[PDB]
Structure formats: C-alpha cells, structure tokens
Amino acid sequence: APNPKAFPLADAALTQQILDVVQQAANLRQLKKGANEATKTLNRGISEFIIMAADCEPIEILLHLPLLCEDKNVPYVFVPSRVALGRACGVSRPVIAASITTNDASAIKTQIYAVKDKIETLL
Amino acid sequence: SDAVTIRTRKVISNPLLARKQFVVDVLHPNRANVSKDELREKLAEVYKAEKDAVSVFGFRTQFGGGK
Amino acid sequence: HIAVGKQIVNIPSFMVRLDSEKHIDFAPTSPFGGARPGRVARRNAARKAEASGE
Amino acid sequence: ENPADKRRRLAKQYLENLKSEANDILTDIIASRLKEDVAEQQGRVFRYFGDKLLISEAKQSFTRVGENNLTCISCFQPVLNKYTFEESSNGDKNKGRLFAYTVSKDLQLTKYDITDFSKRPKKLKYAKGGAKYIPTSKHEYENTTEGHYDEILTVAASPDGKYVVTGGRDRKLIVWSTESLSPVKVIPTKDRRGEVLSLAFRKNSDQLYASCADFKIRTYSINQFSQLEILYGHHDIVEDISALAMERCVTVGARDRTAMLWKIPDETRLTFRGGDEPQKLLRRWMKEPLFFCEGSIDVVSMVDDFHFITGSDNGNICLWSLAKKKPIFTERIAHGILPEPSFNDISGETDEELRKRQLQGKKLLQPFWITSLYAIPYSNVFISGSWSGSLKVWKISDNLRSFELLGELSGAKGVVTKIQVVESGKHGKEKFRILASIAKEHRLGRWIANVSGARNGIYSAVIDQ
Amino acid sequence: KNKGRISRYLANKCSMASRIDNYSEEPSNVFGSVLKKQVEQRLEFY
RNA sequence: CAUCUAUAAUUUUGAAUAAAAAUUGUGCCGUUGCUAUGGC
C-alpha cells in the first residue's frame, strides 16, 4: 500500500551514470564519504546532491538524511548496493551514503549537472 | 635499470641491391640518443649479419626524449 | 613537468580533447612524477652531507 | 662430442620414444604428433579435450593455511623444450617438480611442492615481510628495501624456474630466487600511485608485463633486471592482464569498461567495448526477467592469440575475437544472483509485512561477481570462480563463436581469488590439476558482506581423461 | 584518554540507535541489543 | 647447481640398547575417526 522507505530507487543505467560521477568526484576530491560527513555537508550547505544505499542493515540510520534533503531542497538517489557504492567510491570498505559537494571550477561540472538533472526528474 | 630497445619496422627485402631496408625505432629511457656505432653492433647481432655490413643513418629524437 | 600521455608538452595553449583531458599527468622524467630530484634539492643534500662530513 | 652429433642423438632418442608409444597405441600418427608439437606456437587452439573431461568423479580436496586472506597464486611446471630437448627447469634434482607460490595480505610468500597428484601441497618454504622494511627516506627514488611492507597483491613464477616476482601496494616488484626465497633484486615503480595490481610473464619467455594502477602497463625484462617500456592508454585503473607466447598482452581496465590488446612490436593498441542495453534486452525477451547493466570489468584471460574472455562484476562472461569489436558471445549472470537481505536486518521494526515491503522484492537483487577466470592455453576450456562456493568449468564450441557449461565443482567455500591448471602424465591421457587460492575477502579491498562458511585455503581438484 | 575514546564510540552508537528508534514506526530492542553487545565487545577489546 | 656432513630408509653382526661398509593440511579454539574439518 505505501511506498518503501528507500524510494526513489534508481534504474541500472542511471545507477551506472551515478557511480561514474561518484568515482570521478572522488578522484578530484569533491566527495564526502559517510552519513556523518553527508549530514555535515547538508548543514554547511556545500553539497550538490546525495547518494544513499538502499540496503544497509537497517535502513533508518541513513533514512535520517531525506528530511534534511527535503528541507534544504537537495536531490538524492537510492542506489541498491552499499558494496558497489564503496567500490565505486574508492574506499576499502562499504559506504552507505555519499555527498557530491558543489564547486565552480570543477572539471566534471557538466557531468554532475547531467546526472543531477536526471535525479531531479526522477523525483 | 636502463635498456636500449630496437624495433625494426616495415622490413622490405631488395634483391636488386642485395639488401634489406626498414625503419629503426629506438627506445632509450634515461639515456641520450644511443650512438650509431652501438646501434650498428646491436643490429648486426640481431640480424646475424656483419657490423661492417649493417648501416644506419638519418636519426631524429622525439621531443621530450626517450625515443 | 606535465605530459599528456607520453609527450612532455610545454605549451600552455594546447586545447586538450576528452582523451587528453583524462590522460594529463606528471611527466616521467620530472622530479615530481618520477626520477631523481632537481638541482636545488640535490645541491642542498650535497652541502648538508659536506657540512656533516667536515 | 660435437653439437651436431649431440643434437642428432637426442632427436633420435626422441624419435625412438615416439615410435615405441606408437607401437603401444597401435596394440601418419608420428607425423601428426610432430605437427602438433611444433604447431603449439602459431595461431589458434588445438587442444581438444572439451568433451574428454570427467568432472563427475574429479577428486576434490581442500587445505587450510594459517594466514589470512591469500591474495594470489602462480604455479610453475617444467615442460620439455621442443627445439633443444633439455628441460624447462633449471636444476637436475627438480626432475619435473611442480611448484606453487602463494602470496597473502599477511605479507607472506609461500612455496609449496605439488608434484604428487595424490597427496596434498607440501609447504616447502616461506618468507615474511614486516615493518622493519619501511623505507627511511620518503623520496620515493629509492623504495629499494629488500622486503615487502604493504599488502602483497600478486605473484608470478618465471617459466625458466629461476625466479619469482611479487608485487603489492608498496609499489615495488621484488624478485626472489626460487630455492631459498632470498630477494635477489628490487625495482620500485617510481610513482606516488603506481601500485602493482597484476603480473604476467610472457609465455615461455623472460619478459614481464606488470599492470599498475596509475593507469599504466609497465614492461620489464627479468634476466637483465631492467624496465623496457611503459604503455599508456587506460582511463581508469588497469586491473587485470593476460599474456601468451607472442608479444601481445591483454589488459582490462575497470570502470571505463575496456579491454585493450597491446601489440608491442607494432606499437599498436586495439580497444574493445561492450555496451549492452537493458531496454533492448527486455524487449528482446518480450519478443518471446532480471537484466543488469555493465557495472565494471574485472578479469581477463587470453585463450589463443586471437580470442580472449572477460569477466565483469555484473555476472557477464564475454568472449571476444580480434575481428569484431563487439563481443562475439556474452554469457549472462552465470554465477547466479546474490542472496537477499533478511527482513529483520533490513527493518529493525516489528511489523513483518513492513519489513518485507521494505525488502521491496525484485528491485534489490544483485548478481555474483566474477572474481577469477582462467583458460588453459590454446584449449577450449576455461574456469570461472567467485564466492558462490563452486567453480564452474566451461567449454568453447569448436566453431569458436559460443561456449557452454561443462560442469561445476563444489569444493569451494569463499572468494576464489585465483584459478590455475597444471597438467601431468603422458600425452595420451593427461591428468589435470586445478589449484585455486580461496580466501575470506577480495584481493584489493574488503567490500564483501561476510561470506559464511569460508576459510583461507588452497583448493585442489584432480581431473582425468 | 581511553575514557574519551570510548565515550566517542558510545556517542556514535547512541546516535545510530536514535536514528533507528525515531524513523522506524515501532522500534526494536533486537537492534538495541546488537549495538549494546557491540559496544561491550569493544570494551572487552580495550 | 655440483660435491660433501648429519638427520629420514635400507647392505651386513643383529632380539637389539648396540657397534660397522654405501646410496636417494592450522594463528588460536572445537568436532570426527576408521583423514574430514565448524567459529574468530
């Protein structure tokens, strides 16, 4: 009857595009890794969009994030594996939530804006 | 830890002048444009011919150096 | 110090394409991305070695 | 005493042996056998035991090791040198002794004897690196301490049986002798990100293709102890590499999803991309289920000098031929999809129906990775493994446009880091031996959701006919 | 020193317990006890 | 790597303690027995 708590969840093609921009941002130092760093970037206001894993045990520990996202008008996605998120994030350990921050002199600007456009139409 | 490396390319036999004609690409990292006599020696022991018979000329080092 | 692929490119007006945009890195002959340090660094090491040897 | 008479006498003894075995099989043939023994070198596959195998009664075995997370294993096997009939091995006491060399994240390199197909791998010798090998100066010009001090990540044993090379996250290649495991030479990669991620000796030769994670493929020469050439071209890290007799290597770089074949003398790199479309796949099935996008590309193996197989991490095992750019065949999720999270674990809630409706059903399933892959050289059979607890053995159809699944082997329990094949016995009926290093976690990271019932082991499986 | 580090660990874990306890609809002492046993095993580690 | 010394099995006195000639599965814990293994 209701939605699942994870929703909106991403299709596989959008997931590939998301993880590509995640890896290039982690290469160019734009990516904050972890739920605490993501919440801190949401408070400081520096984030561009949020990726969240939709299978961590349990789901509420990062489900605290969409409330801040809705109150500050940030888009967020839910990808289906924290294992793949940690791998494409470049950590030796699964990450459940990541925050792509904003920058203006960034080499990946239109890549971030393309995927963020896809997310904003996903919502 | 250096190694000159010779790679012949486009070997064309020519029995009219009784020879073979090709292009020689040399790789020489951390080294400055290996001598023509040493290249004659190495090419001779590669093709099993004589140092007094093998001939090389017309070299050009790439910009940045190392080929 | 900077090489696009393998070529040590020293022009600041180069107009990179996409493949170059991903391939830009420090040149392998530089003291930043490779072999022995510069003349200032090894001269400082030499003079410190001398001042310890005397 | 002259080399002419010596080589003539050795060749005549070889001919006597071949003729005698021709007698024992008759209880044309010699020309065909000699044509085979030369025709190993050039071109396509010829070993055709794709149906001869009996995987049913293939006797399995597991051995446990006292060190955690075996990373890689490379096996040495002496083969009679056909041009001059001496041997592959270096000594006289070796007499055709097969060896295995494993390297583990506990900074340990171990050499086992495996020449007896009945008994178990016998740990001959071992060597351990510690924190007493940390380089003093951080200049990175000299990284030349004689031991490993960070996470040995792969190994390769030389086909002349003289050396073994170990590479790891300490951005070095340390080459040790094989008999005492004493480090004869150490070569830094000379880079702040040049971690060695895979190794491959050129088959039956001395060259060495070390693929490192500053997006580069370095090429060394061992018996001279030098570096010949650095090949550039990958966008993401070059993760895996395979090599054969010719001077062509093949590398797979992961998130750019590319397999590049490097012809080294012609100095030319061919590229291969995949690019499946789940929309076209779903409508191609509606023309009559779960379809996964190409997440990455992990493992490669070159089956002959014109085809090679590539295993991704979204289950695809693809077969590529040098003619067509697109994959000539693609086997789907073959190692199966992964288990489902438990509803109490996913909820932390009381209402069981709500736990299920947040388990979401179909939209949360993921496929098993392909952790390791290996083809027997110039054959039509290859082995694929992951943490699904079973090796899968596959046979390429002799038109070399598709392959099918021969069988399973369920001795596996854990992440199959590396698969290797050693053959022995006579040319008539060759005994094969699959040796797989199996661990609890991946090669590179941890990343893995606590595989249950998994040990640090070496899994042997002897197959006949 | 170790008291400060263990209090920081306890702060992390009580924050996570607060997350699950609020955003579930009817919470669960099984994950409460999971987190408590984890902190106690870390204390035994120290 | 070859050679040699000793350990491991044989030639001979020999029941042999004994004196003599030469050669070529685990880091810790737990289960199962006429080797298989569960947890960290």
Coordinates of N, CA and C (backbone and C1' of nucleotides) in Angstrom, one line a residue, chain D residues 61-66 92-93 120 179 413 453 455, chain F residues 1-2 25-29 35-40:
Chain D
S61 N 39.7 -31.6 -3.0 CA 40.4 -31.6 -1.8 C 40.6 -30.1 -1.4
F62 N 40.7 -29.8 -0.1 CA 40.8 -28.5 0.4 C 42.0 -28.6 1.5
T63 N 42.8 -27.6 1.5 CA 43.8 -27.5 2.5 C 43.7 -26.1 3.1
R64 N 43.9 -26.0 4.4 CA 43.8 -24.7 5.1 C 45.2 -24.2 5.4
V65 N 45.3 -22.9 5.4 CA 46.6 -22.2 5.7 C 46.4 -21.4 7.0
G66 N 47.5 -21.2 7.7 CA 47.5 -20.5 8.9 C 47.6 -19.0 8.8
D92 N 68.9 -30.2 -11.7 CA 68.9 -31.6 -12.0 C 68.1 -32.4 -11.0
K93 N 68.0 -32.0 -9.8 CA 67.2 -32.6 -8.7 C 65.7 -32.2 -8.9
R120 N 48.8 -34.0 -0.7 CA 48.5 -32.6 -0.6 C 49.6 -31.7 -0.9
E179 N 64.7 -21.1 -4.8 CA 65.1 -22.2 -3.9 C 65.2 -21.8 -2.5
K413 N 34.7 -22.8 -1.0 CA 34.0 -22.1 0.1 C 34.7 -20.8 0.4
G453 N 30.8 -19.6 6.2 CA 31.4 -20.8 5.8 C 32.5 -20.6 4.8
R455 N 37.0 -20.2 4.4 CA 38.3 -20.3 5.1 C 39.4 -19.8 4.1
Chain F
rC1 P 69.5 -25.0 -6.6 O5' 70.6 -25.8 -7.4 C5' 70.4 -26.3 -8.7 C4' 71.7 -26.7 -9.3 C3' 72.5 -27.8 -8.6 O3' 72.0 -29.1 -8.9 C1' 73.9 -26.0 -9.1
rA2 P 72.2 -30.3 -7.9 O5' 73.8 -30.7 -8.0 C5' 74.3 -31.2 -9.2 C4' 75.8 -31.3 -9.1 C3' 76.4 -32.0 -7.9 O3' 76.4 -33.4 -8.1 C1' 77.5 -29.9 -8.3
rG25 P 50.1 -33.0 6.3 O5' 49.2 -32.9 7.6 C5' 49.0 -31.6 8.2 C4' 48.6 -30.6 7.2 C3' 48.2 -29.2 7.7 O3' 49.3 -28.4 8.0 C1' 46.7 -29.9 6.0
rU26 P 49.2 -27.4 9.3 O5' 47.9 -26.5 9.0 C5' 48.0 -25.2 8.5 C4' 47.5 -24.2 9.6 C3' 48.4 -24.1 10.9 O3' 48.4 -22.8 11.4 C1' 46.2 -24.8 11.4
rG27 P 49.7 -22.3 12.2 O5' 49.5 -20.8 12.4 C5' 50.3 -20.1 13.4 C4' 49.5 -19.4 14.4 C3' 48.6 -20.2 15.2 O3' 49.2 -20.9 16.3 C1' 47.4 -18.4 14.4
rC28 P 48.6 -22.2 17.0 O5' 47.3 -21.7 17.8 C5' 47.4 -20.9 18.9 C4' 46.1 -20.5 19.4 C3' 45.0 -21.5 19.7 O3' 45.2 -22.2 20.9 C1' 44.0 -19.8 18.4
rC29 P 44.7 -23.7 21.1 O5' 43.1 -23.7 21.0 C5' 42.4 -23.1 22.0 C4' 40.9 -23.0 21.7 C3' 40.2 -24.3 21.4 O3' 39.9 -25.0 22.5 C1' 39.6 -22.7 19.8
rU35 P 46.2 -35.6 6.6 O5' 44.8 -36.2 6.1 C5' 44.8 -37.3 5.3 C4' 43.4 -38.0 5.4 C3' 42.2 -37.1 5.1 O3' 42.0 -37.0 3.8 C1' 41.9 -38.3 7.1
rA36 P 41.3 -35.6 3.2 O5' 39.8 -35.6 3.9 C5' 39.0 -34.4 3.9 C4' 37.8 -34.6 4.8 C3' 37.2 -33.3 5.2 O3' 36.3 -32.8 4.2 C1' 37.4 -34.7 7.1
rU37 P 36.4 -31.2 3.8 O5' 36.8 -30.5 5.2 C5' 35.9 -29.6 5.9 C4' 35.7 -30.1 7.3 C3' 35.2 -29.0 8.3 O3' 33.8 -28.9 8.3 C1' 37.1 -30.1 9.2
rG38 P 33.1 -27.6 7.6 O5' 32.9 -26.6 8.8 C5' 31.7 -25.8 8.9 C4' 31.4 -25.5 10.3 C3' 31.9 -24.1 10.8 O3' 31.0 -23.1 10.5 C1' 32.6 -25.8 12.3
rG39 P 31.5 -21.6 10.2 O5' 32.0 -21.1 11.6 C5' 31.1 -20.4 12.5 C4' 31.9 -19.9 13.7 C3' 32.8 -18.7 13.4 O3' 32.0 -17.4 13.4 C1' 33.9 -20.2 14.8
rC40 P 32.5 -16.2 12.5 O5' 33.8 -15.7 13.3 C5' 33.7 -15.1 14.6 C4' 35.0 -14.8 15.2 C3' 36.0 -14.0 14.3 O3' 35.7 -12.6 14.3 C1' 37.1 -15.8 15.4

